[PDB]
Amino acid sequence: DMYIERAGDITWEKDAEVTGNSPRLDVALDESGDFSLV
Amino acid sequence: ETTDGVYRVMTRRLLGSTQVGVGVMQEGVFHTMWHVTKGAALRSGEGRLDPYWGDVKQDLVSYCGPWKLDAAWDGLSEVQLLAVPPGERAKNIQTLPGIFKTKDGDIGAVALDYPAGTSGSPILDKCGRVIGLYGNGVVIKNGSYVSAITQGKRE
Ligand SMILES: O=C(NCC1CCOCC1)[C@H](Nc1ccc2c(c1)CNC2)c1cc(Cl)cc2[nH]ncc12
Secondary structure, X not given: OEEXXXXXXXXXXXXXXXXXEOOEXXXXXXXXXXXXXX | OOOOEEEEEEEOOOOOOEEEEXXXXXXXXXXXXXXXXXXXXXXXXXXXXXXXXXXXXXXXXXXXXXXXXXXXXXXXXXXXXXXXXOOOOOEEEEEOOEEEEEOOEEEEEEEOOOXXXXXXXEEEOOOOOEEXXXXXXXXXXXXXXXXXXXXXXXX
């Protein structure tokens, strides 16, 4: 059986770790909800 | 517990207590990714959550009521992933999304590498609104994971 525990509030925190890139990818979504690169 | 906020999705079927995913409780409705729960009922303390809506292709599922998240990424602003990693405290990571160009239109993409058990973590806009859920995406050349910004439809 599965269960849930609270992890926190949903708010935007100022001065948070700013990391990550913005790639532009060509992808395909199949019938099983799976993405794959084109 | 029907309290608004982000939640951990846990299981006791595997070794010890394993985190399989994450979800959002808003307006008495629990939202997560289909691949996390497979549509199975959830336990919330003494209480229980039954599924209400789901779609394998959209990889989404809502519990106790219809999908409630209607905010969308504006295509310009930086967003924040509220990542809840297994065994770790919830953490806000600010990023500028990329794009998933598909045959049916474009959708935002967050390029943040996190363990599988973090699938279902909300992506937020500057007003603190949930614009989508992280955890359905693809692995690219350098082995880095790029998730889509998965959002459902609100009636
Ligand atoms: O988005 C994902 N991509 C993996 C493949 C899942 C199926 O083929 C294409 C990519 C992972 N979740 C997932 C697992 C099964 C299914 C779905 C999504 C939706 N369909 C079924 C995941 C999510 C996260 Cl947060 C960190 C991760 N690291 N490695 C994997 C992975």
